[PDB]
Structures are given as C-alpha cells and as structure tokens.
Design a binder for these strands. Structure first.
Length: 114
RNA sequence: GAACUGCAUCUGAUACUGUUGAGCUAGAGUAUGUGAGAGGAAGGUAGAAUUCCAGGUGUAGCGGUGAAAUGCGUAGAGAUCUG
C-alpha cells in the first residue's frame, strides 16, 4: 500500500518487527523466535536483522515503498532491524522512538536477587 | 592536754546564695513590612504508563531464563490501531 509504518518492538528477549499501514492495519510481521533462533540467539541483533528482512520483504508484496519506522524498547535488535529494513529497497521517511515511559505510574517488579 | 569535724543561743560582716523595694536592657517575647519553602489539613483536576473490557488488521508464536520449563496462543495470542 505504498505508504507504511514499521513497528520495531524490540525487547531484551525478543524483537518483533511488524509493518502496518498509516491507520495501523498490520500487513506482515516477523519475530526473532520464529526465525530459527531460540534462547540465547533470539536476543541478538542478527536475529532482529533477519526478522526485519523477512517481515519487510513479505510486506513488499502489498506494494509498500515508503516506510516510517517506530522503535520501541531497549532490546539489542533495534538498530540492526532498521538497517535491514532500509537496505532492502525501503525508503525510510523518519526514524522515531516511541517506547513508553511512565511518569511514576505503576510499581515495578521486585529486584532480582541473583 | 588535743580532739570530739556536731548542736543551740547571742554578737558582728555583707562578697556570694536566699527574701524583698526600685530601676535597666544585653537573655526571652510583642506590633508593623517583605521573603522562601515536597510544613500540615480538606477538596478538585491533568498527563504519561500499566491492567482489564469491546472492536479493526493480521498470523504463528508470545512470554520467560544462565539455559529451560510452568503460563498464554489457531476458541486467533503476542504485535499494531481505535474506543
């Protein structure tokens, strides 16, 4: 659909990249746990790279060329995913970081005593 | 003989303590002007976020860990958009 939004929900464990249209209707999506990487490999920038390639090329059937990416989360694969999307024929309009930050809202879980 | 550091009663002194008369302002307070503050109490309200409920897109994973598994998901999750 020519114009689309990439959503890179990067996290410490897994990174999920989904391309939707302007009104937030998903076209294609690919994660790192569904690409052959499990456990330690899933939390790697390369896994996010291949997830971004799979999702972006699978959404290119719909005809999207101009994409604006929206990164969210602290995960390792939040720059490699954008690089994979950009170096795949996509035209990046903007790169915006939209990860949610509470203004001292809900209480966080207790500290891990490892 | 000395001592018995004691008690009593008179006499004397007034530096200090006690009791009193008067005065003073330096300790302590009062009135008046400005100022800072997450000081307190009662109401109201805002925006981010989480969770849940209901829908649209969509499809095979999500989540989690040192690795896993329990758990959630094809009864459609997770992701994304809107209420």
């Amino acid at each position: 659909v020519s114009e689309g939004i990439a959503h890179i929900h990067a996290s410490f464990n897994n990174t999920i990249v989904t391309i939707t249209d302007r009104q937030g209707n998903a076209l294609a999506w690919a994660t790192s746990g569904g690409q052959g990487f499990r456990g330690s490999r899933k939390s790697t920038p390369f896994a996010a790279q291949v997830a971004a390639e799979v999702a972006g090329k699978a959404a290119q059937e719909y005809g999207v060329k101009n994409i604006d990416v929206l990164v969210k989360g602290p995960g390792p694969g939040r720059e490699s995913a954008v690089r994979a999307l950009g170096a795949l024929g996509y035209k990046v309009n903007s790169i915006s970081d939209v990860t949610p930050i509470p203004h001292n809202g809900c209480r966080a879980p207790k500290k891990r005593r490892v």
